[PDB]
């Protein structure tokens, strides 16, 4: 899996947000676009293994919990 963070100032890419759980095993990439002057909200786009591309609510509990896993394994992926 690949996490991409775009430190850009472009217009919003998402017109809706989904809060539906996406199991990590189905995720090929996650793209995070922090908000800025181009888009007034943080966007999180999940690229699923079946090629679906899903804008996700960045305040959804399941994505927050996932992001904590990704943060804590960003220097070592060893499960300790």
Numbering used by the authors: 0 to 79
Original authors' sentences:
CXCL13 is the cognate chemokine agonist of CXCR5, a class A G-protein-coupled receptor (GPCR) that is essential for proper humoral immune responses. CXCL13 is an agonist of CXCR5, activating the receptor, resulting in downstream calcium signaling and ultimately the chemotactic response for which chemokines are named. As elucidated from structural data on many chemokines, this conserved tertiary structure consists of a disordered N-terminal region (6–10 amino acids, referred to here as the chemokine N-terminus), followed by a long loop known as the ‘N-loop’ ending in a short 310-helix, a three-stranded β-sheet and a C-terminal α-helix. Furthermore, we were able to utilize two of these mutants to solve the first uncomplexed crystal structures of human CXCL13. These structures allowed us to observe that the core domain of CXCL13 (i.e. everything except its N- and C-termini) is fairly rigid, whereas its N-terminus exhibits striking flexibility as well as a propensity to form both intramolecular and intermolecular β-strand interactions.
Upon administering both WT and Met CXCL13 to these cells in a dose-dependent manner, we observed that both functioned as agonists, albeit with differing potencies and efficacies. In particular, we found that WT CXCL13 had an observed half-maximal effective concentration (EC50) value of 2.49 nM, whereas Met CXCL13 had an EC50 of 26.3 nM. In terms of efficacy, we defined the maximum activity elicited by WT CXCL13 acting on CXCR5 at the highest concentration tested (1 µM) to be 100% (defining it as a full agonist) and our negative control of buffer alone to equate to 0% activity; our receptor-independent positive control, 2 µM ionomycin, produced a response of ∼119.6% relative to WT CXCL13 (data not shown). Using these parameters, we observed that Met CXCL13 had a maximum efficacy of 86.8% when administered at 1 µM, classifying it as a partial agonist of CXCR5. We were able to solve the crystal structure of Met CXCL13 to 1.88 Å resolution. We utilized the structure of CXCL10 [chemokine (C-X-C) motif ligand 10] to perform molecular replacement and generate an initial model that was then iteratively refined to generate the final structure. Further inspection of Met CXCL13 indicated that there is one monomer per asymmetric unit that forms a crystallographic dimer with a symmetry mate. We next observed the specific interactions that allow the formation of the β0 strand in the Met CXCL13 structure. One set of interactions are the typical hydrogen bonds formed between the β0 and β1 strands to create the parallel β-strand interaction and the four-stranded β-sheet. We also observed that the initiating methionine itself (Met0) was responsible for helping to stabilize this unique feature with both intermolecular and intramolecular interactions.
